[PDB]
Symmetry: D2
Subunit: 253 residues, 4 copies
């Protein structure tokens, strides 16, 4: 079985694919631009991916990979009544380019079924777009669209750390995403079956995508403070389930 | 830092401390009793704990361990009109013997706070008990009491595999517990701060405890199919959750 | 796939089975007697094992487990001219007791292959017993016999740390034991095809056994400073070695 | 602790960098341009590497990283009297190109010490030069030059499957390289302490540097069956050893 793993408790530029306004400042993945005075800037778009393409399914064997990612992010808005737009963990083609800004989070073009994009994303959305979004702040699973196929409620804590875990079991074809705010003892979880064989390509770039608002006032920081990732691809049998107990302790702590 | 980890994708009697009715049958941990034909027995208790004691906190240095556990369990009742009582993952003292059965889940004696227990449990309760339980099915965090300090609703599906992950971050004192039913794509989560230095002893045994109903009809199978665990205790002054569920569970 | 892993950097008395003179003090595992002055004592015998039994071959599935260990040991002798006897990493029946004191290392009875004991050991010999030992200080593989099945020449560095790595694979069966002395920048390696189904029972306890001289001036310390171990039993019909050494090594 | 690891049991081109005369195909890693008939070509330079650069030491803390690797590499030559030249586990800089062919192993320009090369490699020599080499076959460490300071003796097994383990410890600066034969039992080991903060830079491309001779007579093949790697960076003045037992079972075993 082929495996690929990494742990970034501190960020570096050389092993990441930085796109647009994404930059590594003082060990922190600052996806959206900030001023030298500490002010978030509007109309920003940033993308950061791992330098190694990751195999999530094989053509010649028909086997799906089991993979898991963890990360801690912090979204800091000067005003909590005017934030936009949010950040996402995405899997995208090897040389895929940034798309529409703002509510599309640099990942999608529209709310309809766009199979050509070939992108699966777990979004952490802090702006109500109406055209697709639920009423309050939410975590969503995005399949070839910004209109999430499933969502859950996210009681967002302004400027507090958010510890995330995203797991995909190939045998049950289930994508599970959870968010905990350690400062407020709050917990949130999403789970939905997604088949990666027909949605995503064999090789993908794994990383982050974030935007700010299309208006001057709707601004936030979109920093990623830590990020661990693991994947296991089976040889011939469908797949064996991954180990999650030793995943978060060796990576997140 | 000292580490301790294991993965039980198939169970063995040799490396577990079996208590009461808990037994290993065809590589699957049956915590409560069941007939050769497949029907669960009423009024049963079982406990299964790992062989080596795990250090959660060191008194002299003050350092507290970060740990994570993943397991898949199967609760199957002949009739959903009468299910009892439930199963729990718990941390207990070294020489901990089974306590009161039934609603107390073999881990507690009374509804009031008793420091003599020194038990931290994550319960997966399916029966609506008396002066301690919330209205529906629930996950709970038990601390020296059967009355959970915090609960979350859990839509339980009969005879369907539940994927559990429990995590304890030392630096933030946060105990998080999650349950996913992959068959119907349902997920549930709870999080609460627990001071394990005040509650647990320095060395603990980790594992399971389950009970069937005290009445003759209220019966269920309390099975655990897989179980992976890891712990990390520092030396002088977080755990990798990504690689945990893969190598072990995932 | 069943897994079991742990790493030591500082030792404790709770997560180990301690036999005879085996003592834990200041976080270091002292297998043989060291007086309240810092002086080693002759005639001492000790055994230290992990409290969890480890499966090395399963009968019903017909597969042999692949394991690996890594430990830093220090042999501090007041006189290099009279050193006895050494230490060994061993796989032994779960509740098995130490045997002959001295050159037999508290593991074996005689120089002949006796599979009533069922003990596989990797010795680090620092005394010349001659009847079964080569000329000088040596690292050997012991299978049911104190007379090693294979040995390699070992430049024993007195009072210096020795970082060992022992590996066993299922596909190749090549038991490979390597020792490095970082201070002297030296390295030595042993390799022989051993099959565990012919020797050890389904379940064993892994750990260490060390002895001092049968004389009165033959004194040395047999300390273990760190200890890692990982094992994997392949279900149905190769284990990683790189991702292990850094956990406890890298 | 910044972590990075991967285990190949089945190689792919999509996650492999190629330099000069490298090629990735047919269920193995043929580093040199081999013909259809299985013919070793002389006057070549193969270079296969992993996409992510790997950190050796930090600047903001000054902490050296411990790493470990394991691979099953093969050297096969028709004539026993003419083996040339071999391969080396290259830690070549990211922004660096291949150099001289032959006895230089595509790593260094001259036999003299030069800190501009910034490369440390584990040599697997087969040809007799002697100007910067011992009297026979040798496995050692190259420091800022093709000339070695300490090497071991090795029996050149003609086309034998051999599992290798190369490990590094930051605390004692020791590089331990072992080579075992599952069929022949001929095990060999070498270790030497060299400071890497003085020699190597922060980030390097990690893989294999392989070369052939100048004459058609002196030829051999270079193949890799399975390859594994792990690396750990310490945080604040640890000077500690990394786990080694948990790694070797992931790929090899
Ligand atoms: O007010 C901020 C908003 O501006 C809108 O034009 C845009 O569609 C949203 O995504 C958000 O950026
Ligand atoms: O009907 C079965 C029930 O019986 C009660 O007496 C008991 O408190 C419950 O735990 C449950 O076992
Ligand atoms: O000098 C000490 C020695 O004494 C011998 O009689 C014995 O055979 C050796 O094992 C060693 O203990
Ligand atoms: O005979 C072949 C040899 O040719 C030499 O000129 C060269 O220095 C050696 O590396 C080797 O290739
Ligand atoms: Ca939105
Ligand atoms: Ca109850
Ligand atoms: Ca001897
Ligand atoms: Ca040469
Ligand atoms: Mn949305
Ligand atoms: Mn309850
Ligand atoms: Mn001997
Ligand atoms: Mn050379």
């Amino acid at each position: 079985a082929n495996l690929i793993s990494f742990t970034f408790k501190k960020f570096n530029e050389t092993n990441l694919i930085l796109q647009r306004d994404a930059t590594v400042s003082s060990g922190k993945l600052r996806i959206t631009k900030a001023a030298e005075n500490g002010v978030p800037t509007a109309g920003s778009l940033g993308r950061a991916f791992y330098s190694t393409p990751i195999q999530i399914w094989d053509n010649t064997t028909g086997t799906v990979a089991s993979w898991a990612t963890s990360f801690t992010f912090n979204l800091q808005a000067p005003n909590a009544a005017s934030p936009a737009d949010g950040l996402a963990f995405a899997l995208v083609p090897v040389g895929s380019q940034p798309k529409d800004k703002g509510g599309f989070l640099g990942l999608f073009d529209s709310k309809n079924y766009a199979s050509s994009n070939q992108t699966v994303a777990v979004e952490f959305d802090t702006f109500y777009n109406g055209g697709w979004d639920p009423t309050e702040r939410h975590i969503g699973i995005d399949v070839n669209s910004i209109k999430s196929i499933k969502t859950t409620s996210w009681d967002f804590a302004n400027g507090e750390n958010a510890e995330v875990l995203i797991t995909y079991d190939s045998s049950t074809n289930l994508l599970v995403a959870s968010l905990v705010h350690p400062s407020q003892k709050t917990s949130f979880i999403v789970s939905e079956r997604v088949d990666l064989t027909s949605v995503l390509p064999e090789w993908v770039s794994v990383g982050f995508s974030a935007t700010t608002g299309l208006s001057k006032g709707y601004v936030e920081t979109n920093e990623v403070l830590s990020w661990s990732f693991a994947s296991k691809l089976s040889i011939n049998k469908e797949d064996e389930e991954n180990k999650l107990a030793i995943f978060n302790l060796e990576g997140k702590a």
